[PDB]
């Protein structure tokens, strides 16, 4: 969670299911905004902001 410091890789597709979530496709390179929760990380996906499951992304 240093905001904007790090990139993460989408390891799976994920379709947003609630309003604070965001959609990503496997292979997308996301900006990490907030990693303080163990289960949901806040990311930027082409500049949309939202939460995706932490288990579906990794650092490069």
Give your account of this protein's structure.
By secondary structure, the protein is an all-beta fold. The protein is globular and about 25 Å long. The chain has a single domain, classed as SH3 Domains (SH3 type barrels, Roll). It comes from Homo sapiens (Human). Fodrin, which seems to be involved in secretion, interacts with calmodulin in a calcium-dependent manner and is thus candidate for the calcium-dependent movement of the cytoskeleton at the membrane. It is found in: Cytoplasm, Cytoskeleton; Cytoplasm, Cell cortex.
Question: What labels would you give this structure?
Answer:
60 residues, mainly beta, SH3 type barrels, 5-stranded antiparallel beta sheet, 5 strands, globular, Spectrin alpha chain, non-erythrocytic 1
């Amino acid at each position: 969670d240093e905001t904007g410091k790090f990139l993460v890789l989408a390891l799976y597709d994920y379709q947003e299911k609630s309003p604070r979530e965001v959609t990503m496709k496997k292979g997308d390179i996301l900006t990490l905004l907030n990693s303080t929760n163990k289960d949901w990380w806040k990311v930027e996906v082409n500049g949309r902001q939202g939460f995706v499951p932490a288990a579906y992304v990794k650092f490069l």
